[model samples]
Target: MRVGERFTHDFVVPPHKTVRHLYPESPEFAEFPEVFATGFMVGLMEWACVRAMAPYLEPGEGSLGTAICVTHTAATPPGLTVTVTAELRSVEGRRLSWRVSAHDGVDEIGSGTHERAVIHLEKFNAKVRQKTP
Candidate 1:
């Protein structure tokens, strides 16, 4: 994708997506307050970037998140929608990076930089499967 490209995605927070459900088997996580989980927030960020780059990808090509540096500054409760906005900042070879900001209905909950590397899905999957033997 070209630098300076932008995209936005909206996701409604559900109870099952909160920290309490992030790792239900972990007592520490289960006891945590029900807020938007950082893990899911990161996924949302990646998803927005992916959508922005989708039209540019070739057949059998996909991208994998390589890095992220984000701050979850506010707590978002369930039923509120979170909107993630992404702006493509740089593109170097097969790597792409973006600036992202997330806002809930009442607060700016997160901001960060994220990176992804383009890959050939079939080849990548084959490489992953090599570890199974």
Candidate 2:
């Protein structure tokens, strides 16, 4: 996709998205605050980028997040809607980068940069298969 293209998306936080659910088996996680997890926050940002690039992807081709650098500046509780904005900032062959940010009505909860690589789904999955038992 062309640089500077952007996409905006929204997701409502549910109880299962809280930090307590990040590692269901970890007691420490269960004791953590019931705010949205940073992991999910990054995922939501990546998801925004994915939807933004959907029109540009060909059938059977998909994208994967290769790198991300973001700040989780505030906590977001369950039931709140988080809005993410992603802007295409750079393109290098099949690799793409985006400037992203998120807000949850009350606060600017996250901001960062994310990179992804476009790949053919079958070929990509086949490579992963080789690593599995």
Candidate 3:
């Protein structure tokens, strides 16, 4: 990964929204209300960061996330615009690290570090199948 690579994504919050809820108060969407789930939003932000770094990587050279550590500090109400930014921090062989953050129009909503390991997709899937079966 390039040492100075960066990526960003922005989204708007909708009112009475909840994560993955088809109807109001569904058990399936209990974990997060739509304004944005801190966890899910962090993952989205991390992905945006990865996408930003894609052009710098050689073909077939990319990694899946191995670790994420983030803190969601504020709640965003509906109608707010949220932005996530990612910056490449370091690379050591096949392992890479990034700094990430999320912000509402007025304040920071989340921040964290994400780590990924370069790997072949087929090999990674094979390992998952092996463990599951």
What TM-score do all the candidates reach, one by one?
A: 0.95, 0.95, 0.76
Model 2 Cα displacement at 108 (Å)?
0.3
For each candidate, the alpha-carbon lDDT, in order, equals: 0.91, 0.91, 0.74
lDDT of 2 by residue, 27-112 (tens): 76777988999999988998999998887788999999999999999999999999999999997778889999999999999898
**lDDT tens digits, residue span 1-133, model 1:** 5677678899999988888777787887877888889999999999999998888788889999999999999999999999999999998778889999999989999898999999999999999999986
Error of 1 at 37 (Å): 0.5
Q: Per model, how many backbone clashes are there? A: 0, 0, 2
Q: Model 2 segments beyond 4 Å from truth? A: none
TM-score, candidate number 3: 0.76
Worst 10 residues of 3 by lDDT: 16-25
> Model 3: per-residue lDDT, tens digit, 20-112?
533445676666555666656766776776786666566656678888898888887778888888888897877778888889889898888
Model 2 quality (TM-score)? 0.95
Span of 10 residues, lowest total lDDT, candidate 2: 1-10
Every candidate's CA RMSD: 1.2, 1.1, 3.4
Model 1 bad stretches (over 4 Å)? none
